[PDB]
Amino acid sequence: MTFYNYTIDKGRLKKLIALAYRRYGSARCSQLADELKELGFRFATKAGVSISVDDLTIPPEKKQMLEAAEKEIRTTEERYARGEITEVERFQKVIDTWNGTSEELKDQVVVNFRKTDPLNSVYMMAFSGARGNMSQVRQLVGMRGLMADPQGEIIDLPIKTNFREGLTVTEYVISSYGARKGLVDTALRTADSGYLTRRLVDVSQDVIVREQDCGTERSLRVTAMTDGDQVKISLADRLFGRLLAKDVVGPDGEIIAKRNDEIDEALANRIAAVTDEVYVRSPLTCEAARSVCQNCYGWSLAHGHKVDLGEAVGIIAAQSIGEPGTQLTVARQEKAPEDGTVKWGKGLSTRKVRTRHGEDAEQVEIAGDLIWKGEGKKQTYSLTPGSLLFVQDGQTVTAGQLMTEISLTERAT
Amino acid sequence: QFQIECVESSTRKNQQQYSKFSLEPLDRGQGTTVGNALRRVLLSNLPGAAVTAIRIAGVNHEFATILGVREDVLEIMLNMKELVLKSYTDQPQIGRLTAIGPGTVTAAQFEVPSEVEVIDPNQYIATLAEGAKLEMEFRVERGVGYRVIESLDFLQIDSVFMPVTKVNYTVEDIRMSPKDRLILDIWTNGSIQPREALSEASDIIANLFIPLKDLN
Amino acid sequence: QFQIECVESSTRKNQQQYSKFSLEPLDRGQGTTVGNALRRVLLSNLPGAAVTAIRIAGVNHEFATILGVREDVLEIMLNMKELVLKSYTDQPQIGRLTTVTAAQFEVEVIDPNQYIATLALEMEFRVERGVGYRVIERGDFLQIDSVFMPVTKVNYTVEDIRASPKDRLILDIWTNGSIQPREALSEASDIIANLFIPLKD
Amino acid sequence: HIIYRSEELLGAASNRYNITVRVAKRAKENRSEDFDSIDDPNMKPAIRAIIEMSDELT
Amino acid sequence: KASLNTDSFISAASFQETTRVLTEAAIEGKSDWLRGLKENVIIGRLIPAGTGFS
Amino acid sequence: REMAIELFQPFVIHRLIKLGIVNNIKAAKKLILKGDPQIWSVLEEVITGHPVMLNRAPTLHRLGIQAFEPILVEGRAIQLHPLVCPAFNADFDGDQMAVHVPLSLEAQCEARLLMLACHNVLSPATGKPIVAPSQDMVLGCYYLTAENPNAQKGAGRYFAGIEDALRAYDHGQVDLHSQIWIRHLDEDVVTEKPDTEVIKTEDLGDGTVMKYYRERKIREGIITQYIQTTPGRIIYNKTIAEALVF
Amino acid sequence: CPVETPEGPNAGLIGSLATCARVNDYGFIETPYFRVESGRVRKDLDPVYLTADEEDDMRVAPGDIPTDEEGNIIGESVPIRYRQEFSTTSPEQVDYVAVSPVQIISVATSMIPFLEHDDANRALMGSNMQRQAVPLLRPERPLVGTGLEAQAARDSGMVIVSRTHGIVTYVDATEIRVQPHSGEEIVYPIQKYQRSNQDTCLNQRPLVYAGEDVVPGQVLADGSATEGGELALGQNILVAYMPWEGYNYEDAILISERLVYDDVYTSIHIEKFEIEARQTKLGPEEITREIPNVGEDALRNLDEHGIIRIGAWVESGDILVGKVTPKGEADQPPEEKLLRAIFGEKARDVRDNSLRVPNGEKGRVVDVRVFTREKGDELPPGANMVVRIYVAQKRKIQVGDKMAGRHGNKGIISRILPIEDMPYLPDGRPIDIALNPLGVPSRMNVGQVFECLLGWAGENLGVRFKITPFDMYGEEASRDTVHGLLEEASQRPNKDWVFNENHPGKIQVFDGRTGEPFDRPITVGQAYMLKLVHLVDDKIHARSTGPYSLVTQQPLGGKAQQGGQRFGEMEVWALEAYGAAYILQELLTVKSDDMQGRNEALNAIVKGKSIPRPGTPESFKVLMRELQSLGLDIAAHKVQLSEDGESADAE
RNA sequence: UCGA
Ligand SMILES: [Mg+2]
Ligand SMILES: [Zn+2]
């Protein structure tokens, strides 16, 4: 037995249920979940968790961040009356200010729930994942945000209050535009997902595992599903419950992975740490007569072992896709720790351009070392083509000032 | 040890009797054992008496009216449901009521037999206005707790038999000894005394632990 | 109208007895006030015997090690804490001690083989009788923490007897081994009965 | 302990849709053999086919 | 489209375009051998999956 | 009771003629609608071992139809288990569930061996289980294994094993979030932010060295090992021991 | 109204008119507005009632701006709406202002206090659940009411109002007699327990006494769901936001036993039954008492006319009207001819068609009005005597009923605990409802916490606050109103435990079973809960074997006609994904659409030996004959050795 | 029309 010496969340409870299935089966796993809910029902009544008004702790830095955000709006409205910015440049400054202000309020809520009191009734329901969510907490103690029109146009007037301070009559009809849009989109979602599930059944109703083996040699190459910069599905999550078609020989010809070997949960972590492209058996490459082979399909994901002869895999495949159908709705920042005068140089042809905001920025279309002045710390920075710089040759920046913004369409009127 | 005393004994206008008791001394953690066990018996196990059935002598069901009375049969049965009565015979009794005149009907106009008394007078029943007459009669039966009603023109009422309304107790420390001091508040409806309800509640708990120490 | 019997009993390899009782018939609501009042008396208000103070030669404080013994002197304070015995309400006496060799002692010792030492040792302890617990703060005999707990675990469940409805109390008593679970129920019922007899008046 | 006896029967059989037919075909033999006046209300013929098949499995 | 171009005319007429499948099946003289699911439900027999496989 | 007497009506009538109470169906149907207490004793002996399939519309996945073993309860609603609530996607604000009763002997063996709720822990879509604490039991387990830095009441005490701390929780010795050292000789101890480094190395006499850690305290030459934890985490770890080891 | 709309299929197509909205003679909706002249709201004259012409011409401010006492407007930046866009301009440039903050919402949304603190999705549900609350036996006015309940009660038409400004003379339970002054005795009739359309009561109770001056517009007699003056749809009882032992797990309600014996949430439902003595061509039907095969067990409440009396307690399975029907079959089987020839007792020519009480129905009969011919009323053709029976019953609150509040916190009661098991306040008062606090922060139901904490302040004071929605100073009108009035209730010398300095909206609650206090303080308060029409009695349905369809020979569907549950296409796909092939064949053959398989399956359970292999279902043979009538030669064959013959599925 |  092992000793869990940490605080138990919802996601740490699902790892305990999945560990009891792999070792003991289904009868002892259901008894573990039957005893874990006697423990949860007993110590929730003994705790006495309750919601109150003052449990919704509004952070005291909200007033200091709302009057600082309105100063950036007041210095933009006065620039609009001088003809220095357009209507699109004024609209891009107002929306990016209030959306950026709500991100500082959302991060201040999580910090204030850990320094003031770790055992808070709103924080316990959201951090443990019982019923709350951070999109629902920020509407209770933070800012509501920027709502949109019934057609989709974001209104420039924000809702600075929340459900604890109370909305106004003007802020209630703006919030009703999204409540009606979210209500009529739910009823049309069930009619589109219901017809999609029916079409997936009739196209795969006669897909029954009839034979044991077919004797094919084709395979399907699977890799890590990376959506550009960040990864979504790892290699260990795709090899789970699928047989092998080729040997994996990474270190010195390692024979730990052979052909037609059932990959377990811990075995998929060993293949993903050696190679990146694994050839597995798939029903796309299956050569069978009006059926899918038993080795080409893989494991039963609800039983933990291989599939049996004579069971419809197409009905389970059509039901697994149509079930979540009703619940389906590039540049970095730069900084400088030293204040001084930048050195442009003749090596970069920094041309003048205009950004999406109402400010001028010299656009650099080539490389170059944007070196700023310093006493002992020579702060240097590299350029990038297509981005823009802000500092001019001869200007003394302040402490921690933004030097530039390096980079790591649709038509509208 | 175990000195029982009464701190105060308040009494409302013939409708409630509040008394404050005290227990000193006790053990290190027996302030909750004596306190909570005496509260659960006083609120659910004390027997009482109330009006079970009413024959109004002229209306067969409950969803009709009487010509001349301000209230119908249903509002009369709700006023007699909260009537405070007591008895000693352990038998269903019969009490009558007549009313002629334009005045209101109170609990003092009843005709109860021997060993059955009305504790609270001036209980509001339906009023008469100068042109009618009420000849209803009621049945007084004893019971424990709350009974479910699931003869000749009798209307059954789901009466209650709880003479004690609310019991409150706090545990206080005395001044090395970890002993406690328990005070108790008993609120009755006048049908029984709080000193008599404490003696009856202590009889049930003492008899619940008689055959657990002799046979074992 | 009341009957009480034991459903089944069990005893492990160590002397730790266990029994399950049944209370029938109880009134509506009386099954909870009986099982909860019996739980607080059986776990807290029960006299027991334990080791409260030991004395080992060559040991000055609770963190120094003694030559010859594999474990520290804190382990001797923990192994002597779970010593199952009964003093039969006597005056505090002096006990002596000369594999584990737990079978020898200078009071009837129940299950006399749990753990003493694994040396390749002269101890002098005392036995007191009381109720509750005591925590010894640091700063002759070395007084250790002792817990007088003759009954370790009490579980009770209340279910409906028939369909006025009745209740049925199923009481489970996990004793230490010094006293019987049937005997511990008769002692705990004597304490609750002595608190309501002068209250009846 | 009936749910613990069913998980041992479904395991080490290689076909969960075939060993449930042998339980259903043995329960009809236990029902025809229990046609006398003695009828146990706790041990159904469908439950007795699972206990008897797990004892002969070992 | 793949649901209507199958070998069974009963499984295609119950899904969509009943007047178009039965017109093509009558002229071509198609034959359903009751293979697979969604036919034995209409016929009234055991499905070939599950325990009705063998 | 009034719904089970209608669903299991041919099974009650067969038991009445077999026991010798009635002789036909007309004598049995008049005895059922009369309301005798002997009829409910027959209905109690019939439903034992008879599986009943429960079903909630709409049926999105295949775990929306599961079989159960019914019991006669008091009231007029179906007492559903709270653990199968994410499976049926059922909420207690007006949901109605359809009840179905099998007849043949082959249908009873398929509802028990293939359609029972205890054998449906894992979902058919992914490999992740859905029978898990969801809303009210996660909050009971988060508060149990939490850390309250104000209500200690006897923190920093050494106890002899797991069973010594459970006997100290029934008394008023320790709280739920007290810092408690527990002598535990096992090495498989998982925790948040684990470490293998040894800080504050203290050496005793006769060559014995104490290996101090952030949460552990191991006496090296392993002789003893003390674990700093809360008594709420000991009650949680004791529940997994009595459920997985039988 | 942007909030009140039904959810589901008709989401947005069925709207509701607002509070101050008005339709002119042309058919356009108008809204009143106050004139603003030079930054000063001219609240002296009548409004303008603009007919949606303020879009491209006028600048309209809502009713939320802070104004002064006839001087000016306090705010410097007034948010307005101009050409369907929101903007903040100068207060001297505006033209019109709204007359009320409840002008946007309807008359049902305005009954929700603290509407600005609740979400718009839960305010949609709170307005729909308020229109489903049953009238209780003794209603009670809310303590946190909005103040608009008095106007909605008089405009409903079920409240007797005065018109003469006179002196009340005689008051009883049936009429109220006053005399007009500056044929002088008018009689106001009072209906007593009349049946409604949704099986509820329409009882009216007298309010005034004899010898009292009245005014035109004064309540003389309130309705069933109406208290004195204002409307009352529920009760004010104690609430606590604490999880119990799984009894309030997922939107479930735990109530106490005190709500049962105090007649709280007890409504009266009056059902109506119908029978008719029609004209059968074999012989005329008449209502008699001597009906065959029914003894003295059901002929106790008849007055020798076949019809029941008034005030008879009927239960499930009784006989309300005993009606016979003549038959002319004369097609007796040889088994029944031998059984009748032994013991005699030759069968009559009549058949018992008596009106009976359905399953799970009981009550007291209150109206046995019979409408026959030659009495002054018209009858439908083919009918001799029309009997109408009205049965009233008193339903208490039970396990399985659906209760809700004014903020969308609906739920179903799962357990009714006694008062000694519920938690209790430190004065000894127990807790009625133990609600779950987990559903509060996930749905943004903040106004229900403001309502219970303010109603608890009105409980200890007895003042019955009236709080209008949509304020005043920000953060000084909702938090410091509740916490400021809770401090005033704690200043009493008898109530010091009501308010705490550390935790303001919380007190210490003790457990009822063990007597030990909980570890954390719990928010208590006086919540206003309603009782909806979705009771547990109307959802019970079961069927063993009943009627069947006309063509497909399948079981019917319906609670009132003993129907069966439908096993649709999504339910077949779950069993097809399982291994349940024998359960799927059983549900489609021996339980539906088989005139032969249903007989052998029912005979197998009674005898005790089940048989396999059911026959061909009836619904396939109907489709086979329908495709042959379309001109398609479709048939079934056999592929056996040297034999290709068509099979006869019908014959 | 109304519930999920
Ligand atoms: Mg639901
Ligand atoms: Zn293959």
PDB file of N, CA and C in Angstrom, chain A residues 99-119:
ATOM      1  N   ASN A  99     -10.184  44.739 -21.858  1.00  0.00           N
ATOM      2  CA  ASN A  99      -9.881  43.313 -21.835  1.00  0.00           C
ATOM      3  C   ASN A  99      -8.562  43.039 -21.127  1.00  0.00           C
ATOM      4  N   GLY A 100      -7.609  43.968 -21.220  1.00  0.00           N
ATOM      5  CA  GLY A 100      -6.369  43.824 -20.481  1.00  0.00           C
ATOM      6  C   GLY A 100      -6.512  44.128 -19.008  1.00  0.00           C
ATOM      7  N   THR A 101      -7.488  44.961 -18.643  1.00  0.00           N
ATOM      8  CA  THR A 101      -7.716  45.272 -17.234  1.00  0.00           C
ATOM      9  C   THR A 101      -8.374  44.099 -16.516  1.00  0.00           C
ATOM     10  N   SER A 102      -9.273  43.387 -17.202  1.00  0.00           N
ATOM     11  CA  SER A 102      -9.929  42.227 -16.607  1.00  0.00           C
ATOM     12  C   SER A 102      -8.984  41.043 -16.446  1.00  0.00           C
ATOM     13  N   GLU A 103      -7.885  41.004 -17.204  1.00  0.00           N
ATOM     14  CA  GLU A 103      -6.897  39.950 -17.008  1.00  0.00           C
ATOM     15  C   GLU A 103      -6.064  40.190 -15.756  1.00  0.00           C
ATOM     16  N   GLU A 104      -5.830  41.456 -15.398  1.00  0.00           N
ATOM     17  CA  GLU A 104      -5.154  41.751 -14.139  1.00  0.00           C
ATOM     18  C   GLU A 104      -6.065  41.504 -12.946  1.00  0.00           C
ATOM     19  N   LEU A 105      -7.374  41.700 -13.115  1.00  0.00           N
ATOM     20  CA  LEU A 105      -8.314  41.413 -12.038  1.00  0.00           C
ATOM     21  C   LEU A 105      -8.524  39.919 -11.847  1.00  0.00           C
ATOM     22  N   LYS A 106      -8.466  39.138 -12.929  1.00  0.00           N
ATOM     23  CA  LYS A 106      -8.640  37.693 -12.816  1.00  0.00           C
ATOM     24  C   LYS A 106      -7.441  37.044 -12.134  1.00  0.00           C
ATOM     25  N   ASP A 107      -6.238  37.557 -12.392  1.00  0.00           N
ATOM     26  CA  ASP A 107      -5.050  37.033 -11.730  1.00  0.00           C
ATOM     27  C   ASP A 107      -4.952  37.496 -10.282  1.00  0.00           C
ATOM     28  N   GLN A 108      -5.528  38.656  -9.959  1.00  0.00           N
ATOM     29  CA  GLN A 108      -5.508  39.143  -8.585  1.00  0.00           C
ATOM     30  C   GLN A 108      -6.504  38.407  -7.697  1.00  0.00           C
ATOM     31  N   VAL A 109      -7.535  37.795  -8.286  1.00  0.00           N
ATOM     32  CA  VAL A 109      -8.504  37.026  -7.510  1.00  0.00           C
ATOM     33  C   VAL A 109      -7.868  35.748  -6.970  1.00  0.00           C
ATOM     34  N   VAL A 110      -7.097  35.048  -7.807  1.00  0.00           N
ATOM     35  CA  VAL A 110      -6.461  33.801  -7.389  1.00  0.00           C
ATOM     36  C   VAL A 110      -5.352  34.064  -6.375  1.00  0.00           C
ATOM     37  N   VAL A 111      -4.667  35.203  -6.487  1.00  0.00           N
ATOM     38  CA  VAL A 111      -3.629  35.555  -5.521  1.00  0.00           C
ATOM     39  C   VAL A 111      -4.253  35.927  -4.178  1.00  0.00           C
ATOM     40  N   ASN A 112      -5.364  36.669  -4.204  1.00  0.00           N
ATOM     41  CA  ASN A 112      -6.024  37.084  -2.969  1.00  0.00           C
ATOM     42  C   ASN A 112      -6.713  35.929  -2.252  1.00  0.00           C
ATOM     43  N   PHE A 113      -7.068  34.861  -2.967  1.00  0.00           N
ATOM     44  CA  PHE A 113      -7.652  33.681  -2.341  1.00  0.00           C
ATOM     45  C   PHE A 113      -6.615  32.742  -1.741  1.00  0.00           C
ATOM     46  N   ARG A 114      -5.321  33.031  -1.897  1.00  0.00           N
ATOM     47  CA  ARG A 114      -4.275  32.219  -1.295  1.00  0.00           C
ATOM     48  C   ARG A 114      -3.530  32.919  -0.169  1.00  0.00           C
ATOM     49  N   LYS A 115      -3.558  34.250  -0.122  1.00  0.00           N
ATOM     50  CA  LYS A 115      -2.874  35.012   0.915  1.00  0.00           C
ATOM     51  C   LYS A 115      -3.784  35.385   2.076  1.00  0.00           C
ATOM     52  N   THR A 116      -5.052  35.693   1.801  1.00  0.00           N
ATOM     53  CA  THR A 116      -5.978  36.059   2.868  1.00  0.00           C
ATOM     54  C   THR A 116      -6.418  34.830   3.654  1.00  0.00           C
ATOM     55  N   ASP A 117      -7.047  33.873   2.979  1.00  0.00           N
ATOM     56  CA  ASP A 117      -7.494  32.646   3.624  1.00  0.00           C
ATOM     57  C   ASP A 117      -7.474  31.491   2.630  1.00  0.00           C
ATOM     58  N   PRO A 118      -6.736  30.415   2.918  1.00  0.00           N
ATOM     59  CA  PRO A 118      -6.725  29.277   1.988  1.00  0.00           C
ATOM     60  C   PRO A 118      -8.000  28.455   2.032  1.00  0.00           C
ATOM     61  N   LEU A 119      -8.717  28.455   3.156  1.00  0.00           N
ATOM     62  CA  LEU A 119      -9.977  27.725   3.277  1.00  0.00           C
ATOM     63  C   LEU A 119     -11.125  28.724   3.152  1.00  0.00           C
TER      64      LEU A 119
END
